[PDB]
Every structure is written in C-alpha cells, then in structure tokens.
Structure 1
Amino acid sequence: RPRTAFSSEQLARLKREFNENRYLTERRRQQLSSELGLNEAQIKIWFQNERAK
C-alpha cells in the first residue's frame, strides 16, 4: 500500500464526500469501497492524507 492512482471519477466522488464530511466511518468507508472499486485501506489513507493537507 504505497500509491494507487485514482481515476478522475473516483477522485471526484472522494472529493465531494470529503467536502461533506472529512471523517470516515467504517460504514461509509465500506460503501465507498463498494461503489468505487477501491479497497477500504486506500480510501482510509486518502481521507487521512486529505486531512493532513
């Protein structure tokens, strides 16, 4: 788990989600994983990094 390249659609969804709520519950992480085709760890990390910036 170093660097997964998100498609433009994946990133658009994550950015909108982050704008609504910067903190990710496991239940929402599950939904995002399932609706984006990204494993949960990748999503969790993206959220963490997004907050850090």
Structure 2
Amino acid sequence: RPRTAFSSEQLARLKREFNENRYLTERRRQQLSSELGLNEAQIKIWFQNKRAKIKK
C-alpha cells in the first residue's frame, strides 16, 4: 500500500486514542476508519509503530 500523510486532525484524534489505549480492537479500528477517512490498515500500522517508539 502507498505511503500516506495524516492531516493534523487525523493525527490529533489518533494521539488521543492511543492515550486511552495503545491497543485497538477490531470494531474500534473500523470506527476510527470511517470517522477519520483512513484505511484500517494505515491505522493498524500507525498503532504498531507508536507502540514501538514508546518501548524504546
């Protein structure tokens, strides 16, 4: 899949969600997908990477 760039609103909402729970459940991912206008896979990958930076 192509490399994308998140808008400031997308990044803000993504950051507030990760603040509550670093893990996404399926329904939750689907919801953030239609609400933000982002492919579920991009949201899934964003959470993986954010968790990886936190550990380091």
- Using structure 2 for the length normalisation, give the TM-score: 0.88
2: CA distance, partners of 1:3 / 1:51: 19
Could you say what secondary structure the match of 2:47 adopts? helix
* Deviation per residue, 1:4-48 (Å, 9 max, x gap): 100000000000000000000011000000100000000000000
2: CA distance, partners of 1:9 / 1:29: 17
Q: Which has the larger radius of gyration?
A: 2
1: CA distance, partners of 2:46 / 2:2: 11
Runs of 4+ in 1 over 4 A off after TM superposition: none
Where does the alignment leave 5 or more consecutive residues of structure 2 unmatched?
none
Where does the alignment leave 5 or more consecutive residues of structure 1 unmatched?
none
Equivalent residues, number: 53
Shift of 1:2: 5.0
Shift of 1:3: 2.5
- Using structure 1 for the length normalisation, give the TM-score: 0.93
The alignment-based identity, stated in percent, is 98
